[PDB]
Amino acid sequence: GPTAGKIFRAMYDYMAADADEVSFKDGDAIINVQAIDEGWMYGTVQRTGRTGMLPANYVEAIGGGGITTIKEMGRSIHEIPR
Amino acid sequence: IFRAMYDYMAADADEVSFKDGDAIINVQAIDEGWMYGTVQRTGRTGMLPANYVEAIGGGGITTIKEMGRSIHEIPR
Amino acid sequence: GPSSDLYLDSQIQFTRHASDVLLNLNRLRSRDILTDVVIVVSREQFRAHKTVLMACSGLFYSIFTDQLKRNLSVINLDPEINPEGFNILLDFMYTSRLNLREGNIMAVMATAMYLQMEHVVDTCRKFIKA
Amino acid sequence: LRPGGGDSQIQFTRHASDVLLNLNRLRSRDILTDVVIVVSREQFRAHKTVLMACSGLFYSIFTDQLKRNLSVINLDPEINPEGFNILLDFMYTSRLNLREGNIMAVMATAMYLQMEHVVDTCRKFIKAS
Ligand code: NA
């Protein structure tokens, strides 16, 4: 069945420093990530379709299960007698 | 006011139907078997059997629910 | 083996926990357990927990965080304070219920003003004009 | 609206939660805390009244005539401090913060503290029945 996943999103603007890097803007989806290693990742900026190397410290991961709140309405603790 | 003690289904259009626990208001005795009043939940007014309702005694205290903050907040 | 029946971060919020705690604090007060202060109001004495008093009252918060009164297990209120009004407010602190029998609203409001319990004062203002 | 005569009771529906929040604020600021609980390498400041309100074990300790005035209590050596911290936070916030990696420790600590309703809630969380 479907599972909780995680995606990657740029946090800051970046201009590529070489032909193997890609430029992106704050908020860009970074998709089909092939690897993350030592401050660099290889991925596709979805808005432009360009694929290459990105500085990993410019992108954040979003997703997973989060923290789910469950409500319990029963008595929580012992009652001290009167 | 009066409170219904049982469910009742109107037998004709001049009777009212109601459920156990309904409040019946503006009540009037027609005879010692029958009353005329309004079912507050539905707004319907008509005849109902007297033995199906009980008068609620007066003089109770009033309970008021206050949902706002009750006390000062101690800062962190 | 049999089925484990185990579900392969959660926050469980106990919606009546705070009211259960406060009830038990009032049960402790009724049995005089861990009470650490007596409040003296004219000829009348009321034992309580400092932490509950300071949670509810600006006046008691100032008293129990005043370094000069750190050692005090007896607190004397101003002689103008009505002990019946104080008892009503103390019961409110420990129960969430403010008892307003006929004719008592001004004494309760005045007690709440002295105790610097402004949300209670505001509720009394609404009450008295309705 | 109300009659000009007669008696009234105002019920403050969020008072208890407002009190508990203020008790937690006093704890966070170390105001009127009167006990330290030691759990392996870790120490936790608290108010005895809140502990007694929430735990059968602490209720028994602090109503014992010859233990009421202890100010430092070591728990048994198997007690896990992460579990204890989670339970202490619950006492002061009504929120029991669980992970699959620490739910067993929370449950074991709640059993030790005699917090049976919390144990019961943990049982339901872990296992269908
Ligand atoms: Na600690």
Numbering used by the authors:
A (entry chain D): -1 to 80
B (entry chain C): 5 to 80
C (entry chain B): -7 to 0, 6 to 127
D (entry chain A): 0 to 128
From the paper:
The 129-residue BCL6 BTB domain forms a symmetrical strand-exchanged homodimer that contains two lateral grooves that bind corepressors with high affinity. We have shown that the surface of the BCL6 BTB domain contains versatile interaction interfaces with the potential to mediate diverse lattices in a range of crystallization conditions.
As proof of principle, we chose to crystallize the SH3 domain of human nebulin by incorporating it as the guest protein within a BCL6 BTB-domain lattice via its genetic fusion to the NCoR1BBD1 sequence; the nebulin SH3 domain structure has previously been solved by NMR, thereby providing solution-state information to enable the determination of potential artefactual conformations induced by the scaffold, and it has a largest dimension of ∼28 Å. We expressed the nebulin SH3 domain as a fusion protein in which the NCoR1BBD1 sequence was tethered to its C-terminus; a linker of three glycine residues was inserted between the two sequences to reduce potential steric clashes of the SH3 domain with the scaffold [Fig. 3(a)]. The structure of the nebulin SH3 domain was resolved to 1.56 Å resolution. The hydrophobic patch of the BTB domain provided a site for interaction either with the NCoR1BBD2 appendage or with a co-crystallized SH3 domain that was recruited via genetic fusion to a natural NCoR1 corepressor BBD1 sequence; from this perspective, the BTB domain served as a chaperone for the SH3 domain and provided an interaction site to facilitate the 3D ordering of the crystal.
